[model samples]
Target chain A: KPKLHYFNARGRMESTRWLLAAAGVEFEEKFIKSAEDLDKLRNDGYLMFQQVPMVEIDGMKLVQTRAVLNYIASKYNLYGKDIKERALIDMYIEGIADLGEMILLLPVCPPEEKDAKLALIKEKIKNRYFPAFEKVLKSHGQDYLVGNKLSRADIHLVELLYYVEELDSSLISSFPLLKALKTRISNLPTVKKFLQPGSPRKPPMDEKSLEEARKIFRF
Target chain B: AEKPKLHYFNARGRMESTRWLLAAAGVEFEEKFIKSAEDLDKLRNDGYLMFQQVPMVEIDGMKLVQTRAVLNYIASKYNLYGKDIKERALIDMYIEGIADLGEMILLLPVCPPEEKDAKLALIKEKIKNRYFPAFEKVLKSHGQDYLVGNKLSRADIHLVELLYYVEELDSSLISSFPLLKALKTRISNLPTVKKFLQPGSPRKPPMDEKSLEEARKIFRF
Candidate 1:
């Protein structure tokens, strides 16, 4: 069986977890604490980022969360079912990862300037992000983002929608189709089960610790 | 035509685009996931993976390495490259830019918060002052229908997808650039794209509200 070592924080692990759950792949979750743990792993020949969420399949050490998620999605048949659709899905996944990277970088800003930075990001989302997503939703009449049916891109979008709501509840209020799409994805038994607190598969760390760690960076 | 065979370490990072391309193309290929260094070594020794990295694709015994190279190769094979040379070049430029952005974003998970801020600010300023306007000019010149030659190219598909990811990661990052946002919206909602958004698909995880808020606050111009 494949072994996936990830931190308890939500970060990149969530996407990989969702993909695994969606695919029904059986894997072990090893949670590590502190930079010391990471250091020890590194010294022991386990190459990993400073953060958690490193995955070990068989014996190959894989770093980079998005890469891991993409690999898993492809292996399990969740990426997309066709060629054009696969390209579209890959494009979407990469896009989402890019957006998520920017979001992750916000915490490093200085305290006084944080609000200003956020506001600018918000403007972009409203003007660019929302409209781009809106177009896709509108084109599909609120169906999938690409292909004729569900693909990894759809899952990724659902996650993105949920993530936006977390940032600001009103983020998607203006986009009804997107809102509906979120609701639809969350309603999935698998997704709902995954979201439940104390779910057996939750990452090894507590939310508070992750939050605290997140604040260590000054944007 | 027979489907190709893809062999790589069982991680997602580089091979994602290729995997998605295969999936979207609906082409059936053997996904041989190497689990250990020994496995990788064996494959490498066997000439399965010429590159040390995962995501080497073999089509009719012809092996291709590198993620973008493989993606372009498969995309071209499937006629997803675009309609012509100019269009293809434009697509390549956009794809490369997006890839550049992706590389920047990948640094976040490992970067310290303070450093992350400085880096992000640089990225924002560069994009706002330079990249965004350049893209806007492209849109204006291209007549808003497409990124190249008024048709859907792999570049358009990748850019829109990259934009969507950026928005989800931190909507405010690109807020100052309305044209870019509008472009994202326009591309995401295409008829072909709409079909990709169904429930049960593999999408991004919900944004962390606190994180999103923090990012929004940090990237404000």
Candidate 2:
């Protein structure tokens, strides 16, 4: 089994973990919270590119989320059928990744300024980003985002929705295709089982504070 | 070889990897440099910039953007990716590693002349202590000159340019990783790669006269 090394957070590694779960691959999770341990990992030859989401497979380690994601997906045939499909799959992966950076920053922004940033992000997702993904989903079958079945693209789409829905519930509510997409992945047994109610599901924010921020930004 | 047109600012930016890919694959490309600020403005207005970045390419009439996506397309067409599924995965992993390193170097703010050496020392320490030895580990694990399997994949070629650029920063920089040094030397000496090195290429001197001539030997317009 591969050992997935990352900070004990769900920022970039969520998709990787999700990929493994969806593919039914069992792997060990080595969470890094101790700065000393992370540093030791670096000293012990754990990080080649000086960062993580480093999943060690077969004694050799792989870095970079997309590369690892692609590696895992390709191994399981979750990439797609051919080159064109792969490109389209990659386009969505890249697009979501770019949007994900913006999404990830929201929780860390100053509280007084969070609403405006949230509103601006919501505007883009509502008017621009979600519509584009919606069209692609609609033009094809509503079941999967790109290829004939579940792909890393769909996996990422699920995670993007997972985060965005927490930020602004109205935004996800507005897109029927995206609604179905979240439903599709959430309905999967392994994915459903993996997202248990714990510190594992979200940030380290307390329940009351998370709800407070949610109420402030959702309107 | 079918010649392709590369569009970028004359400066070496995101497009360097694709150029190296083409060079390593022995495919020829026409460099369509953004001649001036005005030229960049006009092209920017065209909306083909894809996030308003250069390093775009026009290959067989298919214009592409997004550096990794663009690299994937070229690598696919040129057989520079890898021989099998496993090999391709390794290549992607290695290429992304390089991109991560490249991103770190790009994030370095331009330092004052007084702070230059201090900053270089800082950056050099970061790469040397954090990066090179792990790569050296890979080279030691496999005695193959290549980074991936059997032959030269994009991983090997990408590392060559990365090592070259880092050494350009500090000559003694890569001395610790002699295996990486061997890989770098192995690639720099390829006859076509030598010509690819000759001019307007980011790593070496601009050989304007010999460029088109040397280029003629490797590719057809």
Candidate 3:
């Protein structure tokens, strides 16, 4: 059985968990909230680089969340069709990762600067990130981020939606296709199963910061 | 043939790994330096994929964003990615780990020269304790050998550069991680890599020296 190491939060590991759930891959989860636990993992020599969202797969331990996700995706036939298509998928996933550099930093942002940073994030979503995503959805998505079949990018895109939902709900409101994409991914039978109680998956930010989403999704 | 053009802010910030990949593969590329804020401002409209960041490379008329995308592209073409799916994923994991360590260092809070000691401590804490131990363990378990697949991959080169970088962060650092030392020697011994690090090679951009001199301790450029 494969095992995942990450925090209790629905952080970088969310997509990895969902990908496994979506593919019906059974894995155990071990949450670490302290540096000591991480130290033990490092000392025990399980993780390659002492990072979380690390996965033990096929008797080999792999670090790097995105890599773990891609490994699972490839094993389960979700990476894409071929080299070119996978490259295209990689571009989108990279875009998401680029955007996430800022979103994931919110937790560590000094409190005084949080509001200003949030405002900038909200503005960037409207002016920069989502517009590109909308354009990609227009071009890609034969039913998913790449084509008619599911890909690892789909799981990432779903995580992107939850990221938007967490920061500003109204941000994704106007994105008709975006909403459709989220529904399609979250509704995957396996994905839906993982969404039940005790699931490690959740939105990116605290519910309170989602005023933008409040106006749009009523949440 | 039109070689791929690598565009970045006249610095090696995030693009050096891809550059290393290209160098190791013997792939010729055009290095387009985006110097000056005005030059960067002018590039505001070239449609650089998503999130519009630097380290963007133009290959086959496609402007690829994301450093990882560019690295993967070079690795794929050069056969440095992996021999199979399983190997490929492990390669990706290693590359991502290197990038994560890079991110942590880059994200360190800006510190004045007077406070450099405190800042370096935090960085040293993360790398020395968290990052190095994990990597050393893997190196030890893998018989102090290759990062994955026991074959040379892009990750090896990436790790080599990281060791150099962290050594700059704290020169005494690399000595603590003996396995990394051996790994670095192993990678640096590769024919292509050996040539790439020779005197004539450009490991980082031109301005890195002035920038590092003012912003950091003495480090190899």
Candidate 4:
């Protein structure tokens, strides 16, 4: 079993945990509290990199969330079913992750300035991301993000839409295809089970906070 | 065979990845650190300002810029990209996300400790609201392995290093992201990566802590 040391937050670890849960892999979770704890571990040669979310697999340790995710994805064959689909899936993953970063920046501005930032973001979404995705959805003709199946790219798109809905519901309203895409993903048996009301493994975005964030940031 | 040469600023900001990739791949290269903009200017006059930045790689005289682009090029050369197209693409996505996070982390070095509270809070909110969930979804979908495909790649190494750097600067701030925390651990334990973590191998350059703290507060918000 992999011994995973993770902090108890939804930032970077949620993705790894969700991936583990989705793959039905079991790992131990260790939560570090302070710089001292990290320091002590460093002295003991425990966390060679002096970071958390470190996974110990058969006495080998790995760092970096993307590396971990890729490793796990490969282990479980979650990358995609085929090459073209995988490439498309990667494009979606990279693209959505980039958009996600932009979305997060929405609240960094002062409360008063959030509206302007959000307005700019909304325009970008409408003019850029939404149109690009529209083309992808049209190309794929619905259901999956790429390769006509459930892959990480589809999962990434689902999360990106979920993020938009929670961050700015009105934005979702403007993109019907994206909205439908989220709905389709949400209804997936595995995804639905993972997102069940009380499941330990669920999407990290707080719907209420996201909705509130939308009101605060959306134009 | 002619040696590959890497040119970059003395600082370990963007070019560090290229250096690490070379080290990890056990590929020897001439590492040249440019000390000032004047050095870059002179190099540019000599047609050496490849990609308008430091950390440019000259592989048998072929120059490439952009950290991600360089990383991809090196990963490709070392067979660290992945086994297939999907794996490669996933690697791209993971590296891109890591790079985005790297941008945010870089903000801290120039920020002051006092103002870091407010500035980082803003950054945290963004990470929580947007970046965190996006990654969570990826992990959730893929079953928590690596970011790209099934095998370890340079993306993973970058993410781990970035996460470690963030935790060193502010562990509390980074604790907010759980999936990222776990993912960091998984990467640290990679067999090849473990050796690279040896003392001095990944040692950060000496920087003035007090000055850095002051810079963090007042430099850029």
Q: Per-residue CA lDDT of candidate 4, range A20-133, in tens?
A: 665667777776555555556656755433444566654445555665666676667777764434444544565565576677555445679888877877776666577667
Model 2 per-residue lDDT tens digits across residues A49-134: 65777888755578778778888888888888876667667666776787787877676676898889888888878865787678
For model 2, the docking class works out as acceptable
Per-model TM-score versus the true fold:
0.50, 0.78, 0.84, 0.50
**Which of the two candidates, 3 or 4, achieves a greater TM-score against the reference?**
3
RMSD of candidate 4 to the truth, in angstroms, is: 12.6
Residue B163: error of model 1 in Å?
28
The per-model DockQ list reads 0.01, 0.33, 0.54, 0.03
* A6-43 per-residue lDDT for model 3 (tens digits): 75656577778778887888888887755676778877
Stretches of candidate 4 off by over 4 Å are A1-4, A26-28, A33-48, A57-59, A81-86, A104-116, A202-219, B1-221
True contacts kept of 4: 0.00
lDDT value, residue B89 of candidate 1: 44
What does chain B score (TM) in every candidate?
0.72, 0.81, 0.83, 0.76
Q: In terms of lDDT, which candidate is stronger, 1 or 3? A: 3
Native contacts kept, each candidate: 0.00, 0.35, 0.69, 0.00
Total clashes in model 1, counting residue pairs 3 or more apart in sequence or in different chains? 83
- Distance (Å) between predicted and true CA of A161, model 1? 1.7
Stretches of model 1 off by over 4 angstroms after superposition: A48-52, A200-219, B1-221
Model 3: runs farther than 4 Å from truth?
Answer: A32-43, A195-200, A203-219, B107-116, B142-145, B176-179, B205-221
Candidate 2, residue B146: how far the Cα is off, in Å: 1.9
Question: TM-score: which is higher, 2 or 3?
Answer: 3
